[PDB]
Chain A
Amino acid sequence: XXXXXXXXXXXXXXXXXXXXXXXXXXGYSMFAVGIGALLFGYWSMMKWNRERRRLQIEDFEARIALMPL
């Protein structure tokens, strides 16, 4: 009996298949989150600066109140 190297292909490994595809981001939907984070960013920040004004006037009031200084 002769024994040589046997042939096997099975699945053929798929000859040239695309793996690159669009994922997560679509296009217009990313701008809704992108610019949406900006509008949420300013509104949250400016409310803190209005709360800073409560401290600001109260800080300068200490100088006016102190005349024996």
Chain B
Amino acid sequence: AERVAAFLKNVWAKEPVLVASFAIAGLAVILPTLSPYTKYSLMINXXXXXXXXXXXXXXXXXXXXXXXXXXXXXXXXXXX
């Protein structure tokens, strides 16, 4: 190698802290795209309500029931 192997040990010797400035900040962009865990965090952010939920008038509707615990809508229960 002309740039991979040559410009690595010299960077560790001369100005060694500059290695960390490119490696840590670089991997900070790569990791949130390839690793399959980021999709879970987006769901809980949207599920947690900030304001009170609005009630709609019932006229031929599916997956919608009363306020009591029943199998209706989505309702998040991901990981305990």
Contacts and interface: CB of A to CB of B under 8 A. Distances in A.
Interface residues of A, number: 10
A60 B79 contact: no
A64 B44 contact: no
A64 B48 contact: no
A19 B31 CA distance: 46
Contacts of B76: 57
B50 A53 contact: no
B63 interface: no
The bracket for how many chain B residues form the interface is 10 to 19
Interface string B69-80: 000000010011
A56 B76 CA distance: 13
B63 to A, nearest CB: 18
Given A53-B44, A56-B48, A64 B79 contact: no
A23 B80 CA distance: 47
B59 interface: no
Interface in A8-66: 50, 53-54, 56-57, 60-61, 63-64
B66 interface: no
A34 B51 CA distance: 43
Interface of A: 50, 53-54, 56-57, 60-61, 63-64, 67
Interface of B: 44, 47-53, 76, 79-80
